[PDB]
Amino acid sequence: GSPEFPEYFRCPISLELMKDPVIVSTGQTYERSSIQKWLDAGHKTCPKSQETLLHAGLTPNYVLKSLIALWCESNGIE
């Protein structure tokens, strides 16, 4: 029983959790402030195993916001 999950709720970036979650190639959905922080730096690899995103384009994924927004409501996480 551990609250460990890559997506859906908290970001694996720094356990900040996401509000507006952004999808990128490779199918990652993390918070823009965490992902685009390093993607903008010129890198395009996932934080999991460094799966090269190849095409670095930020596609806003609205599926997760209502979910993550639910979890940071349970615990004030950021």
From Swiss-Prot:
Site feature (Putative E2 binding site) residues: 13, 38, 47
Disulfide bonds: none
Tissue: Expressed in flowers, green siliques, seeds and rosette leaves.
Domain U-box: 6-78
Superkingdom of this protein's organism: Eukaryota
Self-association state and partner proteins as the record states: Homodimer. Interacts with SNL1. Binds to SD11, SD16, SD17, SD18, SD113, SD129 and SD25.
Domain note: The U-box N-terminal domain (UND) is not required for in vitro ubiquitination activity.
Function: Functions as an E3 ubiquitin ligase with specific E2 ubiquitin-conjugating enzymes. Undergoes auto-ubiquitination.
Protein's recorded name: U-box domain-containing protein 14
Gene: PUB14
